[PDB]
């Protein structure tokens, strides 16, 4: 039993809700919140900009030190950093950005990072400003993630389409 509330159950391990991931994280304080990161951990917009804003830019400060030490992530890769005031940990995961021409096949590799954590609060990878089809992202999530994932979908209209079209 965990404290996530109001989710629709899609499969044995995947749950979904129309919610603002920032507000969900502030309420639940999950062990892991997933950020929709880019390889430079520049948290300018989309989910990343919103999460970073909620940390009063502490996420960006920590991320800049991470990059200065380690260099950029790989597309499809991840790193674990602090969750600041939102969660114990933040798993920064880089899905492919279609608006940069990146290979959508890398979306499966991106979701594989979730399997290193027993329970996660997450957005749909590569959705939103990353330009992928969210219906496809949900399909890849369900077919790749085996650990318990709670998906927050900001847009109510999109949430309804994801549920109604879910096979
Ligand atoms: C700011 C923000 C963004 C861009 N997205 C991704 C997204 C948005 C619209 C359609 C699809 C995906 C979020 N997802 C969850 N919570 C959030 N606060 C956000
Ligand atoms: Cl985004």
DSSP count for the chain of H helices, then E strands:
6, 7
Domain that holds residue 43: 8-163
Determined by X-ray
Residue 79 resides in a domain = yes
Report the half-sphere exposure of 125 (CA within 13 A, side-chain side): 32
Hey, whose CA ends up nearest to atom 14 of ligand 1?
154
Burial 3-16 (b: 16+ CB within 10 A, else e): ebeebeebeeebbb
Q: Which atom, in ligand 1's list, is nearest to the CA of 24?
A: 16
Residue 139 resides in a domain = yes
Residue 96 resides in a domain = yes
Q: What share of the chain is helix, strand, coil (3-state, %, to 5)?
A: 40, 20, 40
Measured in Å, residue 80 CA sits from the centre of ligand 2 at 18
What does DSSP assign to residue 129?
G
Helix axes 46-54, 21-28, angle to 10 degrees: 40
Residue 1 resides in a domain = no
Q: CA–CA separation, 36 vs 48, rounded Å?
A: 6
Q: CA–CA separation, 164 vs 85, rounded Å?
A: 34
Measured in Å, residue 16 CA sits from the centre of ligand 1 at 14
Alpha helices in the chain (DSSP H): 21-28, 46-54, 58-70, 106-112, 134-144, 156-164
- SS3 label, residue 40: coil
Residue 3 resides in a domain = no
What does DSSP assign to residue 135?
H
How many structural domains comprise the chain?
1
Residue 63 resides in a domain = yes
Task: Assign residue 43 a region (left: φ > 0; alpha: ψ between -120 and 50; beta: otherwise).
Answer: beta
Residue 83 resides in a domain = yes
Report whether 78 contacts 113 (CB < 8 A): yes
**What CATH number has the domain bearing residue 104?**
3.40.220.10
Angle, CA 77 vertex, CA 42 and CA 67 arms, to 5° = 40
For the record, the structure tokens of 102 come out as: 């990146």
Residue 145 resides in a domain = yes
Angle, CA 130 vertex, CA 18 and CA 13 arms, to 5° = 45
Report the half-sphere exposure of 43 (CA within 13 A, side-chain side): 26
């Amino acid at each position: 039993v965990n404290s996530f509330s109001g989710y629709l159950k899609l499969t044995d391990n995947v749950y979904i809700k129309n919610a603002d991931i920032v507000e969900e994280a502030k309420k639940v304080k999950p062990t892991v919140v997933v950020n929709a990161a880019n390889v430079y951990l520049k948290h300018g917009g989309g989910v990343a900009g919103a999460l970073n804003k909620a940390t009063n830019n502490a996420m960006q400060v920590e991320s800049d030190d991470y990059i200065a030490t380690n260099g950029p992530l790989k597309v499809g890769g991840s790193c674990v950093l602090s969750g600041h005031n939102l969660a114990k940990h933040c798993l920064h995961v880089v899905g492919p950005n279609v608006n940069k021409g990146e290979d959508i096949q890398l979306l499966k590799s991106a979701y594989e990072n979730f399997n290193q954590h027993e329970v996660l609060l997450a957005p749909l990878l590569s959705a939103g400003i990353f330009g992928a089809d969210p219906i496809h992202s949900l399909r890849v999530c369900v077919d790749t993630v085996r650990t318990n994932v709670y998906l927050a979908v900001f847009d109510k209209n999109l949430y309804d389409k994801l549920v109604s079209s879910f096979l």
